[PDB]
Design an enzyme around this catalytic site. Structure first.
Site, PDB file in Angstrom:
ATOM      1  N   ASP A 198       0.885  -1.156   0.000  1.00 49.96           N
ATOM      2  CA  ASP A 198       0.000   0.000   0.000  1.00 49.96           C
ATOM      3  C   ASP A 198       0.923   1.204   0.000  1.00 49.96           C
ATOM      4  O   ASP A 198       1.742   1.369   0.899  1.00 49.96           O
ATOM      5  CB  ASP A 198      -0.959  -0.049   1.194  1.00 49.96           C
ATOM      6  CG  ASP A 198      -1.867   1.156   1.427  1.00 49.96           C
ATOM      7  OD1 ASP A 198      -1.780   2.166   0.698  1.00 49.96           O
ATOM      8  OD2 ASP A 198      -2.670   1.075   2.367  1.00 49.96           O
ATOM      9  N   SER A 243       0.993  10.179 -18.068  1.00 50.46           N
ATOM     10  CA  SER A 243      -0.235  10.541 -18.755  1.00 50.46           C
ATOM     11  C   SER A 243       0.005  11.803 -19.568  1.00 50.46           C
ATOM     12  O   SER A 243       0.798  12.674 -19.186  1.00 50.46           O
ATOM     13  CB  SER A 243      -1.385  10.733 -17.813  1.00 50.46           C
ATOM     14  OG  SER A 243      -2.550  11.222 -18.482  1.00 50.46           O
ATOM     15  N   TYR A 251      -6.115  15.477 -10.809  1.00 47.71           N
ATOM     16  CA  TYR A 251      -5.478  14.386 -11.526  1.00 47.71           C
ATOM     17  C   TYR A 251      -4.223  14.891 -12.254  1.00 47.71           C
ATOM     18  O   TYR A 251      -3.149  14.284 -12.204  1.00 47.71           O
ATOM     19  CB  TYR A 251      -6.467  13.779 -12.519  1.00 47.71           C
ATOM     20  CG  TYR A 251      -5.881  12.689 -13.366  1.00 47.71           C
ATOM     21  CD1 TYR A 251      -5.580  11.448 -12.827  1.00 47.71           C
ATOM     22  CD2 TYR A 251      -5.548  12.922 -14.688  1.00 47.71           C
ATOM     23  CE1 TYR A 251      -5.008  10.439 -13.600  1.00 47.71           C
ATOM     24  CE2 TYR A 251      -4.980  11.932 -15.472  1.00 47.71           C
ATOM     25  CZ  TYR A 251      -4.717  10.686 -14.924  1.00 47.71           C
ATOM     26  OH  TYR A 251      -4.123   9.738 -15.697  1.00 47.71           O
ATOM     27  N   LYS A 266      -0.253  14.139 -12.052  1.00 47.18           N
ATOM     28  CA  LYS A 266       0.559  13.665 -13.169  1.00 47.18           C
ATOM     29  C   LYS A 266       1.682  14.627 -13.568  1.00 47.18           C
ATOM     30  O   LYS A 266       2.798  14.188 -13.919  1.00 47.18           O
ATOM     31  CB  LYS A 266      -0.388  13.354 -14.322  1.00 47.18           C
ATOM     32  CG  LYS A 266      -1.330  12.204 -14.018  1.00 47.18           C
ATOM     33  CD  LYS A 266      -0.509  10.937 -13.994  1.00 47.18           C
ATOM     34  CE  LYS A 266      -1.078   9.855 -13.137  1.00 47.18           C
ATOM     35  NZ  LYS A 266      -0.427   8.587 -13.499  1.00 47.18           N
TER      36      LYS A 266
END
Ligand SMILES: C[C@]12CC[C@@H]3c4ccc(O)cc4CC[C@H]3[C@@H]1CCC2=O
Lengths: 278, 278
Positions: free
Chosen positions: B65, B142, B155, B159
């Site tokens: 994790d 990404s 997000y 990235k």
């Protein structure tokens, strides 16, 4: 009626000088809320306010801790005019060292202040600008949000993270009358070595205190007056169609040209390795 | 044993597919440690592994994790070979929405998994790669890390942060013999509307649904399969000198070249506003 400005991280550096620059402006157009994480550090700001003779009522201090969304709300409410015309997300932390020597707590704090902190301020203040149909947001950006810097891995992460946050928003905000701009700053005049040694290899240790040697010299050559930097924020405010990005220096634009020329990223890596080491 | 590869986020998607791709290699060149946030979810991974007759001892699972540095250290210790040749930082979360409508906690989770999580892996695995003089790191990136996307503010922040982390590292890592590469994915297949109006504004609410409709249709036309992306990690894996970045698709290289062209950002912003809002 004046332009209401609220600014984070005004205890020193860019935020200090920008706040008094706006408050003391001869037009007397600006009402400045200078916010500080800890009000006990407000001394240099009031010394500077007097040295530039900011009119009475032109400058007020608020406690605003960008880690705490309650601190953010409570400062928003202390805005007597009950709107903000200009928001400056300036608050920020640095972090310097080999990645594997940085504490987990220091790493999370940097993201929390520089990235999440800026999210918190945009969540509190952006809606009202959107509803009203006007407002300027200025975010202190960095050269390290444009290109990675050895031993600044997390600093650059946070600063790139702002680029991505701000550019995304900006795409949405293009037709709203709300103008978001980043102010890209090079250096500016505003663990102990055995912890570093224990937590890293001998070769990184050497390269790190080598990097600090190189860094200090670049900073002596390269560091701007913060009055000069503050004035670029002014330039951006005055602009009727402000761009997403302004730069306080051209010194680092050659490297940015080369880095964006080569979209597989290895040109930049060699040049910057070379510039920095040898 | 072999090339030792350790991969995060292997319960589905890119990570599951890369894991079995590598484990089922007929040379048997690879020993794969596929790690999962929760081992109870390892059902689909093993089903896929058997479907490809992955030999015994070609593939093992561990719990890891990326939010817990102790989970990270425990999984490191379980690598019986006492080295890792290829580290694949793949664990990732998305967040879609108008900024002001997202919870503070959701925002902080995304940064903690996507950014801090990857720092924790780099902190734990890079030291041994440096001292050994060798190693690859592959990181799921990404296009949202190279250009800002509306309603994906956090997000994208996350990235872009990985762009800066890895680039900063790469400049340091060149003399150590440790190669870092980002795999730049495009899209990839796997509150209620009044709550949105309530927490946002009228212009925003319109833009959001316009966005939703628009991006559905990019996912229909543009979305690569996890297997295709897995395949690009292989190229990177194998490359004699890997670059900092590899792309999985051509499609967004136009919109990207408008960004790199205008560092001011005004060209990219207007482009992407048009492309999205049509
Ligand atoms: C915004 C976008 C739709 C959504 C895509 C998307 C969605 C999810 C993701 O993880 C990455 C990306 C990258 C490209 C994005 C498109 C560019 C053009 C367009 O309309």
């Amino acid at each position: 009626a004046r332009t209401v400005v609220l600014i984070t991280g005004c205890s020193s550096g860019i935020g200090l000088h920008l706040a008094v620059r706006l408050a003391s402006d001869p037009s007397q157009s600006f009402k400045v809320y200078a916010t500080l994480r800890d009000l006990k550090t407000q001394g240099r700001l009031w010394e500077a306010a007097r040295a530039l003779a900011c009119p009475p009522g032109s400058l007020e201090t608020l406690q605003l801790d960008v880690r705490d969304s309650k601190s953010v709300a409570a400062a928003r409410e202390r805005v007597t005019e009950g709107r903000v015309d200009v928001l400056v997300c300036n608050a920020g932390l640095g972090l310097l060292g080999p990645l594997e020597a940085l504490g987990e707590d220091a790493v999370a704090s940097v993201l929390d202040v520089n990235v999440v902190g800026t999210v918190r301020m945009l969540q509190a203040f952006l809606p009202d600008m959107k509803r009203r149909g006007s407002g300027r947001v200025l975010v202190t950006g960095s050269v390290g949000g444009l290109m990675g810097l050895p031993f600044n891995d997390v600093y650059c992460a946070s600063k790139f993270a702002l680029e991505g946050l701000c550019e995304s928003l900006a795409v949405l905000l293009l037709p709203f009358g709300v103008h978001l701009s980043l102010i890209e700053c090079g250096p500016v005049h505003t663990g102990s070595p055995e912890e570093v040694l224990d937590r890293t290899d001998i070769h990184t240790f050497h390269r790190f205190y080598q990097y600090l040697a190189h860094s200090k010299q670049v900073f002596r050559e390269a560091a701007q007056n913060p009055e000069e930097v503050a004035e670029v924020f002014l330039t951006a405010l005055r602009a009727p169609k402000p761009t997403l990005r302004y730069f306080t220096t051209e010194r680092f634009l050659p490297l940015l040209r080369m880095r964006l020329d080569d979209p597989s990223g290895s040109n930049y890596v060699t040049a910057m390795h070379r510039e920095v080491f040898g």
